[PDB]
Amino acid sequence: GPATKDIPDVAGQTVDVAQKNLNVYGFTKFSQASVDSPRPAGEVTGTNPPAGTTVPVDSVIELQVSKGNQFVMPDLSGMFWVDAEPRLRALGWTGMLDKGADVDAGGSQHNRVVYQNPPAGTGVNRDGIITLRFGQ
């Protein structure tokens, strides 16, 4: 019957490209799930089962597909809010600021971003909430 093969990694590939490459491996049936991701919309973020999993070539592979609805969280350390806000907006952030309590980071950090959530490098939904805490 059908062979069993390792699912190849197709992360970053468009659904069109991913399916074509998977077809060449002998995989024939697919399903698709939309996921939150900063990757360009239509790009595959991964599969279910994951890459490396040995499965029948005639078993369903679910393609996790990026909505392209996230931006990558910048490092806002040391910025005043007057500059950090439009910087975030320029990334497509339509969300809202939740300002936490001031922290003791020294006089040089007065009214400057000290702590942030989510951390830099994290994928953030466009309407996501950003938590910032400024120096006292």
For residue 117, what is the domain's CATH number? 3.30.10.20
Q: How far is CA 127 from the centre of its chain?
A: 14
The coordinates were experimentally obtained by X-ray
Residue 133, burial from CB neighbour count under 10 angstroms (0-12, 13-18, 19+): middle
Resolution for this PDB entry, in angstroms: 2.0
**Structural domains of the chain, count:** 2
Q: 57 and 76, same structural domain?
A: no
Last residue of a domain, one of 26, 48, 68: 68
Q: 60 and 35, same structural domain?
A: yes
Domain containing 73 equals 69-136
Q: 73 and 53, same structural domain?
A: no
